[PDB]
């Protein structure tokens, strides 16, 4: 990177106060060079804080700038630690309003390598307590480093940059420690910096200091770029400037448009709930009256949010004519002791559909882009299509203009959208401020590339997020990414975008902790690659152990939403846990029945009423199902939804092993027939097994002879022999049938 990287890599000299000895043309040569070393940004990101670097001569405690003679503070503690007072020394950085440093003058800065470290030490402190503080200083990051090297094998690192305080202190540094100690860390941070910057010491550091290096490094040529910016967002007399500039460009676009246009550009911005009568007034005569007596709340199909909109879509009917409007309402709640109907489930199911919000974006992130998929109805289907097709061709302004450069947008969301299973424990649950490190890592671990299938709208300036919205993405779009400008201070940017998750620490935003999914865009093209190119290594690496024809397609992928970099890559643990607990001879034997009918282990992040391995082989749309777990005979394959947490399923792992077991209750159904495609569970020798002990293990234990087994077997496996043994003690009145069929399938 050459050229202008000098105009804007020195011009910042607009802080270079040279009250230097009249003897012209030297010092600068020294000053310029002296400063050359210190990163470019980390200079400016000082200017925008009262830019001024005093380079005067001789007696320095004389210069106007230094008149606040804190004679007490005058006892200048030197970087090494040897006491010393102003007069003597040659460069004190005075703090406070319009912070400043007074670098002494002498052609001797190039050579002398000490008053070269100090001038860096200071200009570093002036970076740890000030600049890199108005953001929130070294938070969790520089903490670890700041400790892993406090308790590292070779008790030496410490020795380099610490004190009895930090060195002797018991265990290790813990967040809170950033309390009335920020006046110590800040220093250790400096020293670290102070070194890495100085030419010779980068070397001495590197070796003597493990992690200090890297952190202190990264952060100076690849990470700084940020701090400067997440510090421009702080000040605001620009926070607008940006806003303005970014509009300007996008402005002309916003001018000529249309109501129709600016219209759906809204239809998108906000859903459009169903209707009141129109919906109801669209049912049948028979359908209408059926809708009355429904025992309504009983089916775990209709979630509260919409369950209510149904009891309500009921009153708009009951609110009509004769007395039975008073009596049926009573005579109906009479035999209100029987759960539900089988001719009515549908009567509601077929509704569970039509009563849907229609957000051309909650049914886009619902099908990776399958705007053509049979998850919804026929015409609805054809709208989004018609629509998503228009908006697309609607947002067509490149971006990168003659105005703004590397510019990042933002967005906040909740870990419950990526991986709800971790959602639960994301935040401490015992400090609602402190994020549970534990589940933190588990999150970050495999998160390198995320893709948003849908239309992204983004806050163009860190906007404080809510209380459940806990992730703060600082995505860095790029020249050529297309978006729109939505007054409000928010940009909508096209469909199908790629994001290389290039860092994910955790910050402190106004007394509360936050996860920072800071990323950067890349082409989905380059992303889908990394997937299949991985969809293989999994298969191949599995086909072996499993024992199938090299080059088969068992574990198939389907990830399009924000957590592929773990949607897919997770798998490994899932499957690996499937093998581990069960007995080889089994799965090897059965994983074949399935493949014998070209079935898969579909790890998906879209929605089960969209995953192919189930919809064409479905039957009728009025039905669908969806969730973590799923089993489908018509296409004997396993569908496992990555995000969604489970109804008493501690994790993805234990949700699969179950589901698969459901396929086992399929084996017998063929390992015992020519054409009675049944399920070991659909037997008279089993119905009993169910109508006796079929309700003892847990909640799921019911609703279907089958699932009592799925969960039964699911249980017999537990990471701990306990949870399983319970099935033995509880109802061997099944715990035998399982093991019986197990060591019944292992052979043919």
């Amino acid at each position: 990177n050459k050229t202008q990287e000098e105009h804007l890599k020195e011009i910042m000299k607009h802080i270079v106060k040279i009250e230097v000895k009249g003897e012209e043309a030297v010092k600068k040569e020294a000053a310029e060079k002296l400063l050359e070393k210190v990163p470019s940004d980390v200079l400016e990101m000082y200017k925008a804080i009262g830019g001024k670097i005093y380079i005067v001569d001789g007696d320095i405690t004389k210069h106007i700038s230094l008149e606040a003679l804190s004679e007490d503070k005058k006892k200048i503690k030197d970087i090494y630690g040897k006491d010393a007072l102003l007069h003597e020394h040659y460069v004190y950085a005075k703090e406070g309003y319009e912070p400043v440093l007074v670098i002494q003058s002498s052609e001797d800065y190039v050579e002398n390598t000490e008053k070269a470290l100090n001038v860096y030490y200071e200009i570093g402190k002036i970076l740890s307590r000030d600049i890199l503080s108005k953001i929130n200083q070294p938070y969790q990051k520089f903490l670890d480093v700041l400790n892993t090297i406090k308790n590292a094998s070779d008790s030496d690192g410490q020795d380099l940059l610490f004190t009895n305080q930090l060195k002797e202190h018991p265990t290790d540094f813990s967040v809170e420690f950033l309390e009335q100690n920020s006046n110590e860390v800040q220093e250790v941070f400096a020293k670290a910096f102070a070194y890495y910057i100085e030419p010779q010491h980068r070397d001495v550091l590197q070796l003597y200091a493990p992690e200090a290096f890297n952190y202190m490094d990264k952060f100076n040529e690849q990470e700084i770029n940020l701090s400067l910016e997440e510090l421009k967002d702080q000040r605001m007399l620009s926070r607008y400037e940006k806003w303005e500039k970014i509009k300007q460009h996008y402005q002309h676009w916003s001018d000529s448009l249309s109501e129709e246009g600016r219209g759906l550009l809204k239809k998108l911005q906000i859903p459009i709930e169903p209707k009141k009568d129109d919906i109801i007034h669209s049912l049948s005569q028979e359908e209408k009256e059926l809708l009355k007596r429904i025992q309504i709340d009983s089916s775990d199909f209709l979630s509260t949010e919409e369950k209510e909109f149904l009891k309500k879509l009921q009153i708009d009917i009951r609110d009509s004519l004769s007395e039975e409007e008073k009596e049926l309402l009573n005579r109906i709640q009479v035999d209100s002791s029987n759960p539900l109907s089988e001719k009515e489930k549908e009567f509601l199911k077929k509704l569970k559909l039509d009563i849907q919000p229609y957000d051309i974006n909650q049914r886009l992130q619902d099908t990776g882009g399958l705007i053509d998929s049979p998850s919804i109805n026929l015409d609805v289907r054809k709208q989004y299509k018609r629509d998503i097709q228009n908006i697309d061709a609607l947002l067509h302004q490149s971006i990168g203009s003659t105005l703004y450069n590397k510019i990042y947008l933002y967005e906040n969301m909740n870990i419950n959208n990526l991986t709800a299973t971790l959602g639960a424990d994301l935040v401490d649950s015992t400090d609602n401020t402190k994020i549970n490190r534990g589940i933190f890592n588990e999150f970050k671990k495999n998160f390198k590339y995320s893709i948003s299938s849908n239309y992204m709208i983004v806050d163009i300036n860190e906007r404080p997020a809510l209380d459940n919205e806990r992730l703060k993405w600082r995505i860095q779009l790029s020249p050529d990414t297309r978006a729109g400008y939505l007054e409000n201070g928010k940009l909508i940017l096209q469909r199908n975008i790629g994001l290389e998750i290039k860092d994910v620490q955790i910050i402190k935003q106004s007394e509360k902790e936050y996860i920072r999914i800071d990323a950067k865009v890349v082409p989905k093209s380059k992303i889908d690659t990394k997937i299949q190119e991985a969809q293989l290594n999994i298969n191949q690496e599995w086909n072996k152990a499993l024992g199938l024809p090299k080059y088969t397609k068992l574990i198939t992928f389907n990830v399009h939403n924000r957590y592929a970099s773990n949607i897919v890559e997770s798998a490994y643990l899932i499957l690996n846990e499937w093998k581990n607990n069960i007995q080889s001879d089994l799965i090897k034997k059965v994983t074949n029945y399935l493949v014998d009918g070209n079935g898969r282990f579909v790890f998906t992040d879209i929605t089960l009423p969209n995953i192919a391995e189930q919809y064409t082989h479905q039957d009728e749309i009025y039905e669908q199902v969806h969730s973590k777990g799923l089993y489908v005979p018509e296409s004997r394959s396993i569908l496992l939804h990555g995000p969604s947490k489970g109804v008493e399923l501690r994790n993805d792992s234990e949700g699969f092993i179950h589901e698969f077991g459901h396929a086992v209750d399929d084996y017998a159904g063929y390992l015992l027939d020519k054409n009675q495609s049944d399920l070991v569970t659909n037997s008279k020798k089993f119905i009993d097994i169910f109508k006796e002990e079929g309700s003892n293990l847990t909640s799921y234990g019911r609703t279907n002879e089958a699932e009592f087994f799925a969960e039964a077997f699911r249980l017999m496996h537990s990471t701990d022999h306990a949870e399983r043994l319970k099935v033995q003690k509880n109802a061997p009145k099944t715990f035998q049938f399982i093991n019986d069929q197990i060591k019944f399938i292992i052979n043919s």
Partner: peptide, 16 residues
């Protein structure tokens, strides 16, 4: 706000 969450569940599949 960007949720919905409970798209559906079983029955027994009900037809031939």
């Amino acid at each position: 706000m960007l949720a919905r969450r409970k798209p559906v569940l079983p029955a027994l599949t009900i037809n031939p």
